[PDB]
C-alpha cells in the first residue's frame, strides 16, 4: 500500500490547495466590473490580403517593428512579408515540409521554425552574401515542435510533443534547461514581458507557470475540460488567457492562483486555435474552427464583434506591438490584416 | 524622396524575383502527389517501402509512369496521434497497412486497427481524405486458418454466420476457409467506410503480400481514381 499512501497524500494536498483557492474567492470579476461601461460594437475590416502560400498556414509571428511578419505553411516555405506594401521580402525553402511553428527574433536578425522533424532551425537573415541560410539547427526533442519563442539572439524556448519544454543555447546547440511536468503534448507557450517566466498549455487540460532561471514549475491551473491549444499573457504580466477544444476561453490570475472568467456562448461548439490580447487588454481575440474569429470583452465576457473573412479554419493570430492591427492566418493559404 | 523611390523599386524588384521562383515551385507542387504511410507497428511497414528501394519523419520517393509520389513515414512520435494527424489532411491518400493475420495475438491487434481506422474515417479534418487499405500478411493468415490453431470467431462472433460475398475473386488453389478469413476482415473495414462516406472520400482495400512487388501499380491506379472524382465535383455548379 506504499503506492496508495503516496496517492492519498497527493489527494490530501489537492484538497488543501482547493480550500486555499476558495478562501480567497470572496468575489468575482463579473461582480466588480458590473458597473463599467460596455465596450460597444467592434467592427473591423480587412485591410490587406497576403497571397503566395501554396498550402495551409500553421503559424505566424509579428516583428517588433510592427511592419514585417513571417508565416509558415506546409508547402515547405517560410515567407517574410512587408505588411504595409504586401511585398515578399524573403522566401526560405525548408528541408522538411511539415513546419508547425515559426518565430521572429526581437532583434530582427533571425527566424526560427520547426515541425514534425523534431528540429528547431535558426535562419540568419543578415548574412554578408545576401542569402538566407541555416545558421543552426537544434536537436534533442523526441517529439514534434509545436511552438518556439526567442529570448534574444542566443537563447530560445521551445515546446514539443514529448510533454517537455526546453531552453537552448544557440551558439553551442545544447539544451541549457529542460522543463518537465506536463503529461500531454505541449501545444503553445507565451513569454512574460520581463522574460523571466513563461506559461505553457498542454493536452492534459492544464497550464503551468515556469521559472526560466531556476527551471522549475511554480503554479498549475486546471480550469479547462479539454486540450489547450493556445495561451497568451495579459499585457501587465499578472494574468493570462487560454483557448481549448471545449469551445471555451478562460482567464487565469497568477497572484490569485485561480480562474477568473469564462468566455463561451451557447451556439459555439468549436474549439479555439489561437488567442491574443489587444494592447490595453480589454479585448480578447480568439480564432475558431468554424472559420471565424471572435472579439470578447475581457472584463464583461460579452462578445463584441466577429471577424468573418476566411474560407477555412483559422489557425493562428497575432496583434502588433503598437496595437495597430491584428493578423489572421487560415488553412485557405491566406493571411489577412484586420483593423 | 528620391531615396524612398529607390527603396520601393528595389523592394518591387526583389518581390518580382521571389514570385518568379514561386511559380516554378507551384508547378512542382502540382505535379507531385503526397502520401501518408500509417498503421500498426507489427505490420510490414518496411515491406511496402523496400518494394521501391532519431529523425521525426521519413520520406520515400518513387515515380510511376512519369508521376512523382512522396510517401511519408512517421518515425519518432508518441502514440498520441490526435494532434499531428491533422497535418495530413490535404494528402492524395492515406496508406493504411493492417496485419490481417493478427486477428488473435498476445492483444487484439485487428480491433486496435479497426478503432484507429474508425477515428481516421470520422475525423472532421479527414472527411475529404481517401484511404488506401492494404491488408498485409496473406501467407501468415493462410498458415493460421488452415492449421486450425486459434480462432477468429472468439474475437469476432459474427464470423460464424458470415458467408462469402457473391462478388468474390478467390485466387486459384486455395480452400474456401482462408478466403472467408480475408473477406470478413475486409468487410469489417468496409462497414465503417460505407456508414459515413457521403460521397466525400472513398476506401480502396487490397490484399497485399510480401512477394507481390506490384503495390506501386495499385497505389497509382487508386490515386488516379481519387483525382478523377475530385475533378467530377467541379461540375456541380449549384
Amino acid at each position: 500500500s506504499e503506492l496508495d499512501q503516496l496517492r492519498q497524500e497527493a489527494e490530501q494536498l489537492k484538497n488543501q490547495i482547493r480550500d486555499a483557492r476558495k478562501a480567497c474567492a470572496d468575489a468575482t470579476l463579473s461582480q466588480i466590473t458590473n458597473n463599467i461601461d460596455p465596450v460597444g460594437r467592434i467592427q473591423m475590416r480587412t485591410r490587406r490580403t497576403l497571397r503566395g502560400h501554396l498550402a495551409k498556414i500553421y503559424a505566424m509571428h509579428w516583428g517588433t517593428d510592427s511592419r514585417l511578419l513571417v508565416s509558415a505553411s506546409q508547402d515547405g516555405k517560410l515567407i517574410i512579408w512587408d505588411s504595409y506594401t504586401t511585398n515578399k521580402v524573403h522566401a526560405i525553402p525548408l528541408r522538411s515540409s511539415w513546419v508547425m511553428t515559426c518565430a521572429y527574433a526581437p532583434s530582427g536578425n533571425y527566424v526560427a521554425c520547426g515541425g514534425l522533424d523534431n528540429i528547431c532551425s535558426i535562419y540568419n537573415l543578415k548574412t554578408r552574401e545576401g542569402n538566407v541560410r541555416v545558421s543552426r539547427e537544434l536537436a534533442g526533442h523526441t517529439g514534434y515542435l509545436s511552438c518556439c519563442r526567442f529570448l534574444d539572439d542566443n537563447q530560445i524556448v521551445t515546446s514539443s510533443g514529448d510533454t517537455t519544454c526546453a531552453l537552448w543555447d544557440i551558439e553551442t546547440g545544447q539544451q541549457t534547461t529542460t522543463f518537465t511536468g506536463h503529461t500531454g503534448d505541449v501545444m503553445s507557450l507565451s513569454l512574460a514581458p520581463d522574460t523571466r517566466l513563461f506559461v505553457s498549455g498542454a493536452c492534459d487540460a492544464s497550464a503551468k507557470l515556469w521559472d526560466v532561471r531556476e527551471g522549475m514549475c511554480r503554479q498549475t491551473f486546471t480550469g479547462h475540460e479539454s486540450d489547450i491549444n493556445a495561451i497568451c499573457f495579459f499585457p501587465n504580466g499578472n494574468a493570462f488567457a487560454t483557448g481549448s477544444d471545449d469551445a471555451t476561453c478562460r482567464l487565469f490570475d497568477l497572484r490569485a492562483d485561480q480562474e477568473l472568467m469564462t468566455y463561451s456562448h451557447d451556439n459555439i461548439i468549436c474549439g479555439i486555435t489561437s488567442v491574443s490580447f489587444s494592447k490595453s487588454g480589454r479585448l480578447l481575440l480568439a480564432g475558431y474552427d468554424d472559420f471565424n474569429c471572435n472579439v470578447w470583452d475581457a472584463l464583461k465576457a460579452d462578445r463584441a464583434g466577429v471577424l468573418a473573412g476566411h474560407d477555412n479554419r483559422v489557425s493562428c493570430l497575432g496583434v502588433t506591438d503598437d496595437g495597430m492591427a491584428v493578423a489572421t492566418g487560415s488553412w485557405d493559404s491566406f493571411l489577412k490584416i484586420w483593423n | 524622396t528620391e531615396d524612398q523611390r529607390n527603396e520601393e523599386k528595389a523592394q518591387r524588384e526583389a518581390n518580382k524575383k521571389i514570385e518568379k521562383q514561386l511559380q516554378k515551385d507551384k508547378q512542382v507542387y502540382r505535379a507531385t502527389h503526397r502520401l501518408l504511410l500509417l498503421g500498426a507497428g507489427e505490420s510490414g511497414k518496411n515491406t511496402i517501402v523496400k518494394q521501391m528501394r532519431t529523425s521525426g519523419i521519413f520520406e520515400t520517393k518513387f515515380q510511376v509512369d512519369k508521376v512523382n509520389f512522396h510517401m511519408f513515414d512517421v518515425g519518432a512520435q508518441r502514440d498520441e496521434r490526435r494532434k499531428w494527424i491533422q497535418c495530413f489532411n490535404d494528402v492524395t491518400a492515406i496508406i493504411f497497412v493492417v496485419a490481417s493475420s493478427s486477428y488473435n495475438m498476445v492483444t487484439n491487434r485487428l480491433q486496435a486497427a479497426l478503432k484507429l481506422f474508425d477515428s481516421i474515417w470520422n475525423n472532421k479534418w479527414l472527411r475529404d481524405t481517401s484511404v488506401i487499405l492494404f491488408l498485409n500478411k496473406q501467407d501468415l493468415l493462410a498458415e493460421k486458418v488452415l492449421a486450425g490453431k486459434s480462432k477468429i470467431e472468439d474475437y469476432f462472433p459474427e464470423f460464424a454466420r458470415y458467408t462469402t460475398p457473391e462478388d468474390a475473386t478467390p485466387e486459384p488453389g486455395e480452400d474456401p476457409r482462408v478466403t472467408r478469413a480475408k473477406y470478413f476482415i475486409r468487410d469489417e473495414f468496409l462497414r465503417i467506410s460505407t456508414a459515413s462516406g457521403d460521397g466525400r472520400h472513398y476506401c480502396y482495400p487490397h490484399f497485399t503480400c510480401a512477394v507481390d512487388t506490384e503495390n506501386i501499380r495499385r497505389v497509382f491506379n487508386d490515386c488516379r481514381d481519387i483525382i478523377q472524382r475530385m475533378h467530377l465535383r467541379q461540375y456541380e455548379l449549384l
Epitope: 479539454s226 486540450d227 | 478503432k115 474508425d118 477515428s119
Partner: nanobody
C-alpha cells in the same frame, strides 16, 4: 479539474457478475463519449466498449459482446459496465476513459498509454 474515479472491482468466481461505476466530475458528462478500457497483467491496453452522448449507440469488442453491458446516467454523471458470466481471461485493471473532445464522432488516444482523460482504474480478478 477533470477527474474520473472507478469503483466496483474485486475478486469474483468464474461465471460471476460484477457491476462497475465511474463517477465523473470537472466536465459536462452529457457532451462527451465514454469508453471502458482494460489492461491485462502482461498485455497492453485494450478497448472494451463505448457509449455515445445520449446512449443509443453502443459497441462492444468481440470477446465481451453479449456478456457486458455499458450504461449511462447523464443526470448523475455516472458510467456503468454490467459484467455477466465472467471468465478467467477477464482479469485486468479496468479504466473509465473519456474521449478528448465534445460533440465528436472520433476518439483517438483512448487506449494510448499516459492518457490524460483516463481514471486510475479498478482491479477485477476472476479466479477460483
Amino acid at each position: 479539474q477533470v477527474q474520473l474515479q472507478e469503483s466496483g472491482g474485486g475478486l469474483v468466481q468464474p461465471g460471476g457478475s460484477l457491476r462497475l461505476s465511474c463517477a465523473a466530475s470537472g466536465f459536462t458528462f452529457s457532451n462527451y463519449k465514454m469508453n471502458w478500457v482494460r489492461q491485462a497483467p502482461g498485455k497492453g491496453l485494450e478497448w472494451v466498449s463505448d457509449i455515445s452522448q445520449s446512449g443509443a449507440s453502443i459497441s462492444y469488442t468481440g470477446s465481451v459482446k453479449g456478456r457486458f453491458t455499458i450504461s449511462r446516467d447523464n443526470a448523475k454523471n455516472t458510467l456503468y459496465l454490467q459484467m455477466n458470466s465472467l471468465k478467467p481471461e477477464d482479469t485486468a485493471v479496468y479504466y473509465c476513459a473519456r474521449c478528448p473532445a465534445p460533440f465528436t464522432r472520433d476518439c483517438f488516444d483512448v487506449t494510448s498509454t499516459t492518457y490524460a482523460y483516463r481514471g486510475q482504474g479498478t482491479q477485477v480478478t476472476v479466479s477460483s
